[PDB]
Coordinates of C-alpha atoms and ligand atoms in Angstrom, one line a residue:
X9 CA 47.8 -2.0 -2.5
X10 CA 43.9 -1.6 -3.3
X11 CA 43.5 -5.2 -3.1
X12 CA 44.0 -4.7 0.5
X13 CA 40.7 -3.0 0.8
X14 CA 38.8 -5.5 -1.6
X15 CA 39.8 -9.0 0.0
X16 CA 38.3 -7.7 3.3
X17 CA 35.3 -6.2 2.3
X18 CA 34.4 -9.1 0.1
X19 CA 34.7 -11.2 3.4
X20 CA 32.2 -8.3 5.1
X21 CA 29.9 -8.8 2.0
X22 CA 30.0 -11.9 2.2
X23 CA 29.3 -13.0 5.8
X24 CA 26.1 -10.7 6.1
X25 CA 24.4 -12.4 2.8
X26 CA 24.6 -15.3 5.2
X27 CA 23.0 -14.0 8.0
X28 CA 20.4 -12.0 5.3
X29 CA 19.2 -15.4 3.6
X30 CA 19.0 -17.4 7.1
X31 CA 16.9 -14.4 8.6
X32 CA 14.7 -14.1 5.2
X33 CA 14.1 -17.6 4.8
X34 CA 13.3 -18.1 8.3
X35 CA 10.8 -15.3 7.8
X36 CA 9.6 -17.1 4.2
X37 CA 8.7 -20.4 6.4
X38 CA 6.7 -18.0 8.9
X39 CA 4.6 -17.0 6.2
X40 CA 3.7 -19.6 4.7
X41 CA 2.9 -21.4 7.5
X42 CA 0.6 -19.5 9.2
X43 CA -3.2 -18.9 8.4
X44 CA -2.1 -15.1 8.0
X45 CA -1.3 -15.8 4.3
X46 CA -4.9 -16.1 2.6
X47 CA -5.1 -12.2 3.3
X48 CA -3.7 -9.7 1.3
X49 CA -1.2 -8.3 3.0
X50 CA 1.2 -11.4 4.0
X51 CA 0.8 -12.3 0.1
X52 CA 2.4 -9.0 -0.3
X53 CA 5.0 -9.9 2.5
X54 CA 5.4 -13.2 1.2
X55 CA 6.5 -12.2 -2.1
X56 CA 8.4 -9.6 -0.9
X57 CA 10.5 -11.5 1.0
X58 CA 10.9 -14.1 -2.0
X59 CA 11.9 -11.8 -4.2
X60 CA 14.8 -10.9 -1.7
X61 CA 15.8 -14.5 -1.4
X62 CA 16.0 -15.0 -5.1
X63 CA 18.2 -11.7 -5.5
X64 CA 20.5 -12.7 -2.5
X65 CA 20.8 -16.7 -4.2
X66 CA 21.9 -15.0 -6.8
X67 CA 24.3 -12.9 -5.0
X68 CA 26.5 -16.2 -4.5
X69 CA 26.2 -16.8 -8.0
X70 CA 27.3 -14.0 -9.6
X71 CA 30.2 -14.6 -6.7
X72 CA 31.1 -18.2 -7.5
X73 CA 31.1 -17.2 -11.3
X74 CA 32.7 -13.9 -11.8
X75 CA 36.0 -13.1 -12.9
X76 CA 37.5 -10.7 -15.7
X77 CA 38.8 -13.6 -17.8
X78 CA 35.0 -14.8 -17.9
X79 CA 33.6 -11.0 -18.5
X80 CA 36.3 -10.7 -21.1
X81 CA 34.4 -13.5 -22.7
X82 CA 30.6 -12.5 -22.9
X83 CA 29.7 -16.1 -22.5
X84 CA 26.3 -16.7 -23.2
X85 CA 25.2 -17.8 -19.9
X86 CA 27.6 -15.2 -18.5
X87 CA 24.8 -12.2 -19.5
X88 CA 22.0 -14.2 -18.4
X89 CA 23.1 -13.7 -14.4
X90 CA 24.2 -10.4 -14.9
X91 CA 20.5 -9.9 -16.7
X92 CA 19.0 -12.5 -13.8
X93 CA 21.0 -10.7 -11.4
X94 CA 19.5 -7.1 -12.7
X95 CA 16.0 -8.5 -13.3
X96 CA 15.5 -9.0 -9.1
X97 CA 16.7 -5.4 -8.8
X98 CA 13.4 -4.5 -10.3
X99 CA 11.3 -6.9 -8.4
X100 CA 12.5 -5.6 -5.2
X101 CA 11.6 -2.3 -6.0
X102 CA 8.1 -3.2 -7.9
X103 CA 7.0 -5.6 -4.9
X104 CA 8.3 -2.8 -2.6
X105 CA 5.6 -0.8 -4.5
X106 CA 3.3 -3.1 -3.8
X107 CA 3.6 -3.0 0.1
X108 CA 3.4 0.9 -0.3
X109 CA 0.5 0.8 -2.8
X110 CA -1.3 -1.5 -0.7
X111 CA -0.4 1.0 2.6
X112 CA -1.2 3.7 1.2
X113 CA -4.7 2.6 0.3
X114 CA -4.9 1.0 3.9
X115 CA -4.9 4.6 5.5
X116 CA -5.6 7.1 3.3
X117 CA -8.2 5.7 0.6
X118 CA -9.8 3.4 3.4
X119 CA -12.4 5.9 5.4
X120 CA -15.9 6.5 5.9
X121 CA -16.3 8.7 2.9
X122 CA -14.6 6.1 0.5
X123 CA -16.9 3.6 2.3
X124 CA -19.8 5.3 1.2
X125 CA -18.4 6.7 -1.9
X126 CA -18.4 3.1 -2.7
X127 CA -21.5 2.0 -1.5
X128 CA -24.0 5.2 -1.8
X129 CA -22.3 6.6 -5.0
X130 CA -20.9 10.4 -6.3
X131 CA -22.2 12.4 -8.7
X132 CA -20.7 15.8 -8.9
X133 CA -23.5 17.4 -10.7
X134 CA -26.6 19.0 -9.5
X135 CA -29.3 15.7 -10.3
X136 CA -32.7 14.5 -9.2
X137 CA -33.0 11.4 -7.0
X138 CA -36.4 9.1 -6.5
X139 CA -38.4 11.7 -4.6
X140 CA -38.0 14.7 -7.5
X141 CA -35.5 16.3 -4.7
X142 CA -32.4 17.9 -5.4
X143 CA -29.5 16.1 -4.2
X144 CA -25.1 16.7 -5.1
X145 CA -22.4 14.8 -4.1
X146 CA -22.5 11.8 -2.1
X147 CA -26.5 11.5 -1.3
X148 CA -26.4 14.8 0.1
X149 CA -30.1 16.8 -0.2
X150 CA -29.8 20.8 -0.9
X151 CA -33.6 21.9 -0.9
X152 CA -37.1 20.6 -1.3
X153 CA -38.1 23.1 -3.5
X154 CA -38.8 22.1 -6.9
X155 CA -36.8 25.3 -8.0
X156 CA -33.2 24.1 -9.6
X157 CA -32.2 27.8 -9.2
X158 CA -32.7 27.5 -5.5
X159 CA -30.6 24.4 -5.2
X160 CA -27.5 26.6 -6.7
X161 CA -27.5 29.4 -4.0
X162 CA -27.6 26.7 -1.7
X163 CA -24.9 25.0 -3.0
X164 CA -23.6 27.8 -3.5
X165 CA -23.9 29.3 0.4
X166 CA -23.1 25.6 1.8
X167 CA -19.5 25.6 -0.1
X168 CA -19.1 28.8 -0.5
X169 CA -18.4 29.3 -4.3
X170 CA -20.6 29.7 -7.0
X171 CA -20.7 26.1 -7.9
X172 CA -23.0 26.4 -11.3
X173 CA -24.6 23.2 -10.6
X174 CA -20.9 21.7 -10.1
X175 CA -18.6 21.0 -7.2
X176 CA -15.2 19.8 -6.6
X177 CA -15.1 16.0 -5.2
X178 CA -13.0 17.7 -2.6
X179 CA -16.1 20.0 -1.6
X180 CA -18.2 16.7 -1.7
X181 CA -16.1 15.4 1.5
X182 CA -16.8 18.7 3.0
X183 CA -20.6 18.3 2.5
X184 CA -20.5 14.8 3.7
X185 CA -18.8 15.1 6.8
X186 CA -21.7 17.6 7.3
X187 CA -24.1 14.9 7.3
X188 CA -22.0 12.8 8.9
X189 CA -22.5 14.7 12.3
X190 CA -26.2 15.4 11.3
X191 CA -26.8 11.7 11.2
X192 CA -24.1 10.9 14.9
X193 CA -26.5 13.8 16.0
X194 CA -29.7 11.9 15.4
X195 CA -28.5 8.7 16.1
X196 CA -27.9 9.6 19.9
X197 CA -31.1 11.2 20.3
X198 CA -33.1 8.4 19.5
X199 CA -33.4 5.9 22.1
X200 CA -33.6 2.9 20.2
X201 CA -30.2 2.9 18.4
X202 CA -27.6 5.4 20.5
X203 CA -27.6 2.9 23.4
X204 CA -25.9 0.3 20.5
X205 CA -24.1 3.2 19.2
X206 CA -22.9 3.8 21.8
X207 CA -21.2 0.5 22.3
X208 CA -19.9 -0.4 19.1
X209 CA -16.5 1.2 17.8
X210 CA -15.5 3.1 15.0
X211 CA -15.7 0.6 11.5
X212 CA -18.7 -0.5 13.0
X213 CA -20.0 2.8 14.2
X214 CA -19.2 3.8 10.5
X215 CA -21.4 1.2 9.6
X216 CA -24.2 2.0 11.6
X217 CA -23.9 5.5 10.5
X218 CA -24.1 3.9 6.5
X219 CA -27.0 2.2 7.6
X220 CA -28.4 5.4 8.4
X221 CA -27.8 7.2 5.7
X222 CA -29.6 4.2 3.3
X223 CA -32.5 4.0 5.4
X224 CA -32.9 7.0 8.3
X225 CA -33.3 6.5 11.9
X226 CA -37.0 5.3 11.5
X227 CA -36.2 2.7 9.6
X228 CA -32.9 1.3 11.2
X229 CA -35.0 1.6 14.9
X230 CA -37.4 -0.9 13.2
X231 CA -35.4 -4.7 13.8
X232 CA -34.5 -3.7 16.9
X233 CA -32.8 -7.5 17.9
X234 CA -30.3 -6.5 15.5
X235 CA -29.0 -3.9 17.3
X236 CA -29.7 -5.8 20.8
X237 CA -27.0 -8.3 19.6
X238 CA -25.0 -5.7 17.9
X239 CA -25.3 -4.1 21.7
X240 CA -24.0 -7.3 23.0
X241 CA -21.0 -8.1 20.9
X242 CA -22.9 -11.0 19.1
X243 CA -20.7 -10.0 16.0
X244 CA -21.5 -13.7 14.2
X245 CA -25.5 -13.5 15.3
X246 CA -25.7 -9.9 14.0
X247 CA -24.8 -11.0 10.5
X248 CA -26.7 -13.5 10.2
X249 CA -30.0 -11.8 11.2
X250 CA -29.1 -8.8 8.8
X251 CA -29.1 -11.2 5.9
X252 CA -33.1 -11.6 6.4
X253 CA -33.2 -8.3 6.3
X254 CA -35.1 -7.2 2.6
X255 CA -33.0 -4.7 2.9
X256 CA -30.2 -7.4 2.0
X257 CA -32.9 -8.9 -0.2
X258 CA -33.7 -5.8 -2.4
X259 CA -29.4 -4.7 -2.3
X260 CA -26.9 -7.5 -1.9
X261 CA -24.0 -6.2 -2.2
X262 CA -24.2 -3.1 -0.4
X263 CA -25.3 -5.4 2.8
X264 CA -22.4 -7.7 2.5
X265 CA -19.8 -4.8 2.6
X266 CA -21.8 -3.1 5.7
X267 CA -22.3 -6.5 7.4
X268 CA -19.0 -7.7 6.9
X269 CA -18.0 -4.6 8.2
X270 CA -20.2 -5.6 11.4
X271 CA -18.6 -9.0 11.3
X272 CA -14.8 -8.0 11.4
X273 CA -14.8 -4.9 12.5
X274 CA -12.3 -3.9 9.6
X275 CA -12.1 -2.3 6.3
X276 CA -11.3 -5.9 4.9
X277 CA -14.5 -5.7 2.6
X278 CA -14.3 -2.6 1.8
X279 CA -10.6 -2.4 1.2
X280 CA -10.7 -5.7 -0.9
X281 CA -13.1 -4.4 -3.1
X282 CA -10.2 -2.7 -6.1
X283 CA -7.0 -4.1 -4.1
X284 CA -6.6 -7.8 -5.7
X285 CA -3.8 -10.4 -5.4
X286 CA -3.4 -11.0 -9.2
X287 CA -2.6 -7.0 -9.7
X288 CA 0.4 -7.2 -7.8
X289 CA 1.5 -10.6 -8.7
X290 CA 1.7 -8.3 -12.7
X291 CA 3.1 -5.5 -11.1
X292 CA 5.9 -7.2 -9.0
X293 CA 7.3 -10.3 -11.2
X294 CA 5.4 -9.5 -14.7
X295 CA 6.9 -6.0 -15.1
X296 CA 10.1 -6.4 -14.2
X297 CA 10.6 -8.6 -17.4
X298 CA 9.7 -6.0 -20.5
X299 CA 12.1 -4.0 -18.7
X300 CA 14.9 -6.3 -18.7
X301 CA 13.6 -7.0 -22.3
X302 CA 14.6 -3.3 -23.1
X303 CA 18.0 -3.3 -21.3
X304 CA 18.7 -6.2 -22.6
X305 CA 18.3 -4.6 -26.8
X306 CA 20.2 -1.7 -25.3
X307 CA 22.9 -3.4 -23.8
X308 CA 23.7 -5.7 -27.3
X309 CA 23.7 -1.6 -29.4
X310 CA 25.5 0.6 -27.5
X311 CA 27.3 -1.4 -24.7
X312 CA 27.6 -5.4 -25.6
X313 CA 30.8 -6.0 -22.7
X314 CA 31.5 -7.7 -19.7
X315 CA 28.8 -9.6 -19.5
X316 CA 26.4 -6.8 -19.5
X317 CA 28.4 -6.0 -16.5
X318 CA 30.8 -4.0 -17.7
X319 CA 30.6 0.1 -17.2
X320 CA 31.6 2.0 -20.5
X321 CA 31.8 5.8 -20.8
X322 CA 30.2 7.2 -21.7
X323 CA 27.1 5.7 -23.1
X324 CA 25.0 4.3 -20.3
X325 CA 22.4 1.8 -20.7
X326 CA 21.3 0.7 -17.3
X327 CA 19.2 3.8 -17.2
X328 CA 17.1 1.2 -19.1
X329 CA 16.3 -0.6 -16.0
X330 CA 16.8 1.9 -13.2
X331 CA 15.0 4.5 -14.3
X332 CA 11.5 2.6 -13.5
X333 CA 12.9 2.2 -10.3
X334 CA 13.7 5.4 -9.8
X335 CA 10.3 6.5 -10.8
X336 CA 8.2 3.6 -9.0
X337 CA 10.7 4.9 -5.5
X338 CA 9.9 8.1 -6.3
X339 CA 5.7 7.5 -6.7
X340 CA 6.1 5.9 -3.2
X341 CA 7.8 8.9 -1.9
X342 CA 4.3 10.7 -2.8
X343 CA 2.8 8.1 -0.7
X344 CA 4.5 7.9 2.4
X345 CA 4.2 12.1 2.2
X346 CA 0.1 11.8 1.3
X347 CA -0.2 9.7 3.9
X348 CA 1.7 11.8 6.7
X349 CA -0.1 15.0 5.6
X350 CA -3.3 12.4 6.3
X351 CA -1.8 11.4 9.5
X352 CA -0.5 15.0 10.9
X353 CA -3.6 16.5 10.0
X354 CA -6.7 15.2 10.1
X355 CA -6.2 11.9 12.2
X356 CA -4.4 13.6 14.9
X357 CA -7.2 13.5 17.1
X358 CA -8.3 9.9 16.2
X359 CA -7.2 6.8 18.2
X360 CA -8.3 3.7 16.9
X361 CA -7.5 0.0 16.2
X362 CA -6.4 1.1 12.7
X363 CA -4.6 4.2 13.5
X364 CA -2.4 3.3 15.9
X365 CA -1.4 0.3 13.3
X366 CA -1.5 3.0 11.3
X367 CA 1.9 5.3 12.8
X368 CA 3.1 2.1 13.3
X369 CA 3.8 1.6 9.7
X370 CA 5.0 4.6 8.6
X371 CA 7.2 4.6 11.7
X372 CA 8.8 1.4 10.5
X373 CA 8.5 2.8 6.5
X374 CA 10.6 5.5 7.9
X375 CA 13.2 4.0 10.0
X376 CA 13.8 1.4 6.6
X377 CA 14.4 4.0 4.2
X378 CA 17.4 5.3 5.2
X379 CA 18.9 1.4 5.3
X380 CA 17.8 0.6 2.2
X381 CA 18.0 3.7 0.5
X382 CA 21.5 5.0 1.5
X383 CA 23.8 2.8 -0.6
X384 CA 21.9 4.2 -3.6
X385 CA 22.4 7.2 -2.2
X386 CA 26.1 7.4 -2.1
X387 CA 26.4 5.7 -5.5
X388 CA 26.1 9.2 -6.8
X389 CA 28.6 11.0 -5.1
X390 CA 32.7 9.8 -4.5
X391 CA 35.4 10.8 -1.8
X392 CA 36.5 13.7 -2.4
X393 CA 39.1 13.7 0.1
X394 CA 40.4 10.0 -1.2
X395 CA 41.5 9.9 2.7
X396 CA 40.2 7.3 5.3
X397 CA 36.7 8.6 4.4
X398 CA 36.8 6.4 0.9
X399 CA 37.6 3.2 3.1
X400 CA 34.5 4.3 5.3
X401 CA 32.3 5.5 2.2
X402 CA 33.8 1.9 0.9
X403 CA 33.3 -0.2 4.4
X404 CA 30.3 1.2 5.2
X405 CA 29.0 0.5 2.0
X406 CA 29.1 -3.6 2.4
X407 CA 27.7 -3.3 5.8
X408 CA 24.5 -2.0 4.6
X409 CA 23.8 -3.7 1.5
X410 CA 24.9 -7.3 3.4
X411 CA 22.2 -6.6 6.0
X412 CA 19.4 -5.5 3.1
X413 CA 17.8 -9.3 4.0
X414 CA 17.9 -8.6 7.5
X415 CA 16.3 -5.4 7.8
X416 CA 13.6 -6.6 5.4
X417 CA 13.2 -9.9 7.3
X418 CA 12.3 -7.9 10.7
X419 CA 10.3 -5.5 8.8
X420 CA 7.8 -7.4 7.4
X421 CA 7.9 -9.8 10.3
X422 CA 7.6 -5.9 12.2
X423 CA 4.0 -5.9 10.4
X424 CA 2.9 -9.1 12.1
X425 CA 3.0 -7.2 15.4
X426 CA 1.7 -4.2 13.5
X427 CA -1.5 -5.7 12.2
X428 CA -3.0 -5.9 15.9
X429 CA -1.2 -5.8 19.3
Ligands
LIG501 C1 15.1 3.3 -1.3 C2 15.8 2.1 -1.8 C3 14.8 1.0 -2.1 C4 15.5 -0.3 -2.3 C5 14.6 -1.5 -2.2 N1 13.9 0.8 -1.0 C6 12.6 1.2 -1.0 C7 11.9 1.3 -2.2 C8 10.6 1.8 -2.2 C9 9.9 1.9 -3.5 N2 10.0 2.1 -1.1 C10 10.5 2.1 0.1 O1 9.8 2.5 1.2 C11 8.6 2.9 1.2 C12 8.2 4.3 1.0 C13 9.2 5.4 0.8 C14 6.8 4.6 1.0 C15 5.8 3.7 1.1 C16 4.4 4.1 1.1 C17 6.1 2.3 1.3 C18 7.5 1.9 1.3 C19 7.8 0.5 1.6 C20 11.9 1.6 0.2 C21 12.6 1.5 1.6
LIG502 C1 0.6 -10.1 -17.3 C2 -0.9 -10.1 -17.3 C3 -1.5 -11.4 -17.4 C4 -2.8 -11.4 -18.2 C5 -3.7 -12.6 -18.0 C6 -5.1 -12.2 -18.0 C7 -5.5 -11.8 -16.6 C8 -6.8 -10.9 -16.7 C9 -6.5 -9.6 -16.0 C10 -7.4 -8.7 -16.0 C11 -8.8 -8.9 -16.6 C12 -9.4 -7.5 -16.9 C13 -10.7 -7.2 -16.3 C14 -10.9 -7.8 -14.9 C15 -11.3 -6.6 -14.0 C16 -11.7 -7.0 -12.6 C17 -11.2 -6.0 -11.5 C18 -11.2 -6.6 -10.1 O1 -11.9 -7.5 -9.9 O2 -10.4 -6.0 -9.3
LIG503 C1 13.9 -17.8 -11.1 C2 12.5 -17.7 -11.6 C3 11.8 -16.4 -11.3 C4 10.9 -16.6 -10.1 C5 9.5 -15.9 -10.4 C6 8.5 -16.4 -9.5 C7 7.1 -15.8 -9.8 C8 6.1 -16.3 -8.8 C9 4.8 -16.2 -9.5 C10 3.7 -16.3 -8.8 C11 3.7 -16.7 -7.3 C12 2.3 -16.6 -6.7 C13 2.2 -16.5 -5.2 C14 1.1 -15.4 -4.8 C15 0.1 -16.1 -3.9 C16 -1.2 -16.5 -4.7 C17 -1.8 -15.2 -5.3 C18 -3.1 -15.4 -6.0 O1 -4.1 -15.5 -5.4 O2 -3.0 -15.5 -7.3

């Protein structure tokens, strides 16, 4: 009678984890292969997609080894799928994590105030820098009178609250994206460096602008053929001349970040700087395991049956596992919504080389979700009417959790076109 149903979906199920490991493995040999996997972000990808190909292996295996006779027995390699099976559950959400961590970062904590914030340095308190002035926030002068209670009701009349000496680091963007046009102001007055200004693009312009900010106008006008290969696309030229510079000689690592920045036009040395490989390799596959660890203790307590694969009422153990991945989809969710309020609101205007790679991954974090996340959805909830509906909630169900490998093949093979086109 019911069997009915189950001898055809497991056909369903099982024809689409054929097409899911072909299509992710094929993607796995793109990865690896191309010179696109000593940056970050196909390390990310390539991992991701491993973990999917270990989960979906073992897919067959929990196939070609599952019956009730065995679960009757727990066998002692009988657990260790189920717990194998259960561990790559995690993964896929923790390396999942990573490619939102790593997005996330990517548009919202990668911008010329973060740049600077970096480079420059925040205090949040009223302090003196090397000329006895008065300075708050990111480099930001207040007044040249050696008066602290005059540097307040400035502060205070620039923000707008009575500040005590303090502000909010929110306040300090404010106040920085003040000087920001102050500086693009000056810049394009002077005749020396708004010509090259004028040419370069917006990482680079940001870096011009930094330059600015370390030095003034007087003293960026000075090299002068700098600039006049800067003003001629000589990216490779440019860098090397800017290492002469003392100013590289008296700070080295600010100049690497601003002339890298020159060099490849990208964030890449600024958005390198916290976002490491090793992190992620912890978070993804070393994570996952003190979690199993846990389920595992629970699972020989309260509910040691069917190879840990068994469901018993009503004490329920797999909370164990699913909860942190619960918790880590739900920390993403915050991201993908941090970043859209970042993207609706204050990059509307903008169209650059990063932004419009930028809507282009939140399109395609958008369109996955609802593949991925619907058969997690439905879990929760059962027909109800018991009619044709429960063979649709049923068939519909194999469909999508076949096709996981698919989806995620094209998606992060999606973000190969993504990264520039
Ligand atoms: C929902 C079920 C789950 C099964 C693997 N899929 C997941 C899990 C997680 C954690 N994030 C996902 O997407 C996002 C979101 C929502 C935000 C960002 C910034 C990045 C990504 C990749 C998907 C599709
Ligand atoms: C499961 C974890 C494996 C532990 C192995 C030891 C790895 C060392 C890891 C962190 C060292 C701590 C300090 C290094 C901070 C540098 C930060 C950075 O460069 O991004
Ligand atoms: C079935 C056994 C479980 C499989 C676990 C595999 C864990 C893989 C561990 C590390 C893979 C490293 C690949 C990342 C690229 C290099 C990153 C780096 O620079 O350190």
């Amino acid at each position: 009678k019911s069997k009915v149903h189950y001898h055809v979906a497991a056909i369903i199920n099982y024809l689409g984890h054929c097409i899911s490991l072909v299509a992710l493995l094929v993607a796995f040999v793109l990865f690896l292969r191309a010179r696109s996997i000593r940056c970050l972000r196909n390390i990310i990808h390539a991992n991701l997609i491993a973990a999917f190909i270990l989960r979906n292996a073992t897919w067959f295996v929990v196939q070609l080894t599952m019956s009730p006779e065995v679960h009757q027995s727990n066998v002692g390699w009988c657990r260790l799928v189920t717990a194998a099976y259960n561990y790559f559950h995690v993964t896929n959400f923790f390396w999942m994590f990573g490619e939102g961590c790593y997005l996330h970062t990517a548009i919202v904590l990668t911008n010329i105030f973060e740049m600077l914030r970096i480079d420059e340095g925040l205090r949040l308190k009223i302090y003196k820098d090397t000329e006895g002035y008065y300075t708050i926030g990111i480099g930001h002068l207040l007044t040249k009178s050696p008066s602290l209670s005059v540097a307040k009701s400035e502060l205070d009349k620039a923000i707008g609250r009575n500040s005590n000496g303090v502000i909010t680091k929110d306040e300090a963007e404010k106040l920085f994206n003040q000087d920001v046009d102050a500086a693009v102001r000056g810049i394009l007055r002077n005749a020396k460096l708004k010509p090259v200004y004028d040419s370069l693009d917006a990482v680079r312009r940001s870096a011009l602008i930094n330059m600015v900010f370390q030095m003034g106008e007087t003293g960026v006008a000075g090299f002068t053929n700098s600039l006049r290969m800067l003003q001629q696309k000589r990216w490779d030229e440019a860098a090397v001349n800017l290492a002469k510079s003392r100013w590289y000689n008296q700070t080295p690592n600010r100049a690497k970040r601003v002339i890298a920045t020159f060099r490849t036009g990208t964030w890449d040395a600024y958005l390198t700087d916290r976002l490491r490989a090793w992190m992620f390799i912890c978070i993804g596959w070393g994570v996952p395991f003190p979690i199993i660890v846990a389920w595992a203790i629970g699972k020989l307590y309260y509910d040691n049956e069917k190879c840990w694969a068994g469901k018993r009422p009503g004490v329920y153990t797999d909370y164990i596992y699913q909860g942190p991945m619960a918790l880590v989809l739900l920390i993403n969710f915050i991201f993908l919504f941090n970043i859209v309020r970042i993207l609706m609101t204050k990059l509307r205007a903008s169209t650059t080389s990063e932004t419009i790679q930028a809507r282009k991954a939140v399109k395609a974090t958008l369109v996955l979700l609802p593949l991925l996340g619907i058969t997690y959805m439905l879990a929760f909830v059962n027909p109800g009417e018991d009619e044709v509906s429960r063979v649709v909630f049923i068939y519909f169900n194999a469909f999508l959790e076949s096709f996981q490998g698919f989806f995620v093949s094209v998606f992060a093979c999606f973000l190969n076109s993504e990264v520039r086109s």
